[PDB]
Paper text:
[name] functions as the substrate receptor of [name] ubiquitin ligase complex, comprised of Elongin B, Elongin C, Cul5, and Rbx2 subunits. [name] contains eight ANK repeats followed by C-terminal BC and Cul5 boxes that mediate the Elongin B/C and Cul5 binding, respectively. [name] has been identified to target physiological substrate DDA3 for proteasomal degradation, and recent global protein stability (GPS) analysis unveiled its role in recognizing internal degrons of multiple substrates. Among them, [name], functions as a regulator of cytoskeletal organization, endoplasmic reticulum stress response, and cell division.
To investigate the recognition mode of degrons by [name], we determined the crystal structure of [name]-Elongin B-Elongin C complex bound to a 23-residue peptide derived from [name] substrate. The [name]-degron adopts an α-helical structure spanning ~5 turns over 18 residues, followed by an extended loop of terminal residues. The α-helical [name]-degron, extending from N terminus to C terminus, aligns in an antiparallel orientation against the ANK repeats from ANK6 to ANK3. Based on the structure, five residues E1-L5-E8-L12-L16 on the α-helical degron are almost entirely buried in the bottom of the groove, defining this region as contact site 1. By contrast, residues L2-M6-Q9-E13-R17 are associated with the solvent-exposed surface on one side of the groove, termed site 2, while residues L11 and K15 on the other side of the groove constitute site3. At site 1, two negatively charged residues E1 and E8 mediate the [name] bound through electrostatic bonds. First, the carboxyl group of E1 forms a salt bridge and hydrogen bond with the guanidine group of Arg185 from ANK6. Second, the carboxyl group of E8 engages three hydrogen bonds with the side chains of Thr151, Ser147 and Trp118. In addition, the nonpolar residues L5, L12 and L16 establish extensive hydrophobic interactions with [name]. Site 1, containing five residues, serves as the primary binding site, where two negatively charged residues (E1 and E8) form multiple hydrogen bonds, and three nonpolar leucine residues form robust hydrophobic interactions with the bottom of the binding groove.
Residue numbers in the entry:
A (entry chain B): 1 to 23
B (entry chain A): 12 to 316
C (entry chain C): 1 to 2, 10 to 13, 15 to 18, 29 to 34, 47, 58 to 59, 65 to 66, 68 to 71, ...
D (entry chain D): 18, 27 to 39, 61, 65 to 109
């Protein structure tokens, strides 16, 4: 369901941004 | 230029004796690098607990949000499961300003801890009375982050602290059905998740999706806990109508749905439903305080199912 | 198209207040848990 | 086919105070009528105050 896809997009973004300091 | 480079290295090395020396001589603990990171951000991310404590003692502000997310030092502690560093910051005079602080996109420390499955850090935040269901900028609560990374233990902890199991009108049951996680489905049912909520986009219920995926075990658990067989989605289909958009019979899921969508269920279960609705599906320990027999209450709690 | 004693479908032919009200058509104080 | 009696085929769905037996009967009718039928099954209303007793009665 596209319901999950956006939620997973959001958790993608959480991980990207927390880890950005070494990127 | 020397002093900021030297205090940094003392922290990264864990040389806390130096850090206390420079603070006594007037070096302020409150500058920022180009990412907005303070020494409390650096100290928390690298796990340097002793450095963290002394920085606080000399006025280091833990509320500062970095320039790359609006994350606080407590967010980066939440990420790496650094409970002890976090417990220091939560014992400081800034507890109520940091405990629920939101990043730019609305993630609190509890959001971060639940997402990474940091049990201790989740108990920590609830120990200091963090809000259990803060909303992200997309409407997401921490439990939902826990749910979708399948951090079962943090799921169990948040539900135990009264996280809304029915968030976004039954999304936890939706998740269990979409993934066919029957353990999750059974656990959310035994904990009282309401089975008769439709998603606000397409009005689908858990029973509806337990038919889109011909999962008879999900369909059965939902019905057995009282999912309504004639509720209709936004396109008018009942749950059985959904299984008929695939039709072709010959499968236990529509065979079960047929047998329950025509014969109205027992009066013993119809009274179970109304009593549990009257008493409230999230207040079902009030049933132990009722004037009935064990067998009767056993039936009420769906214990022997 | 469809005393101290008391139904059926439908004539007062009755071998024992159309002239919506359906086959489905003291209790003590409910305990405090169901209030 | 207080007191009451009905088609034994209605009571095939199975002389407890009056209020209980009153509706235990209304159920038998509603069951058969909507059993194996071709329309949406309306709600069988159960008032909360009689509900705990109607459950104990329903050995169904």
């Amino acid at each position: 369901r596209q319901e999950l896809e956006s939620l997973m997009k959001e958790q993608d973004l959480l991980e990207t941004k927390l880890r950005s300091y070494e990127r | 230029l020397q002093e900021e480079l030297q205090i940094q290295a003392a922290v990264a090395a864990g040389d806390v004796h130096t850090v206390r020396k420079m603070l006594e001589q007037g070096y302020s603990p409150n500058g920022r690098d180009a990412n907005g990171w303070t020494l409390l951000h650096f100290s928390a991310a690298r796990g340097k607990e002793r450095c963290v404590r002394v920085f606080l003692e000399h006025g280091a502000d833990p509320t500062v949000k970095d320039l790359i997310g609006g994350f606080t030092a407590l967010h980066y502690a939440a990420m790496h499961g650094r409970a002890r560093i976090a417990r220091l910051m939560l014992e400081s005079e800034y507890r109520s300003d940091i405990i629920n602080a939101k990043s730019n996109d609305g993630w609190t420390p509890l959001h971060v801890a639940a997402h990474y499955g940091r049990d201790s850090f989740v108990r920590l935040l609830l120990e200091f009375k963090a809000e259990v269901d803060p909303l992200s900028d997309k409407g997401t609560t921490p439990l939902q982050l826990a749910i979708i990374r399948e951090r079962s233990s943090c799921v169990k902890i948040l539900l135990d602290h009264n996280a809304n199991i029915d968030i976004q009108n039954g999304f936890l049951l939706r998740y269990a059905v979409i993934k066919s996680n029957h353990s999750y489905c059974r656990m959310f049912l035994q904990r009282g998740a309401d089975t008769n909520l439709g998603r606000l986009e397409d009005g689908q219920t858990p029973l509806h999706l337990s038919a889109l995926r011909d999962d008879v075990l999900c369909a059965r658990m939902l019905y057995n806990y009282g999912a309504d067989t004639n509720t209709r989605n936004y396109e008018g289909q009942t749950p059985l109508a959904v299984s008929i958009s695939i039709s072709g019979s010959s499968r236990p899921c529509l065979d079960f749905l047929q047998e329950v969508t025509r014969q109205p269920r027992n009066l013993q279960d119809l009274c179970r439903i109304k009593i549990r609705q009257c008493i409230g599906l999230q207040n079902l320990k009030l049933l132990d305080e009722l004037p009935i027999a064990k067998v009767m209450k056993d039936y009420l709690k769906h214990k022997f199912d | 198209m469809d005393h101290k004693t008391t139904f059926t479908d439908a004539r007062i032919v009755e071998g024992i207040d159309g002239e919506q009200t359906r086959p489905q058509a003291s209790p003590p104080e409910l305990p405090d848990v169901m209030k | 086919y207080h007191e009451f009696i009905v088609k034994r085929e209605h009571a095939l769905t199975s002389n407890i105070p009056s209020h209980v037996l009153s509706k235990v009967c209304m159920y038998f009718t509603y069951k058969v009528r909507y059993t194996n039928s071709s329309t949406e099954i309306p709600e069988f209303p159960i008032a909360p105050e009689i509900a705990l007793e109607l459950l104990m009665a329903a050995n169904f």
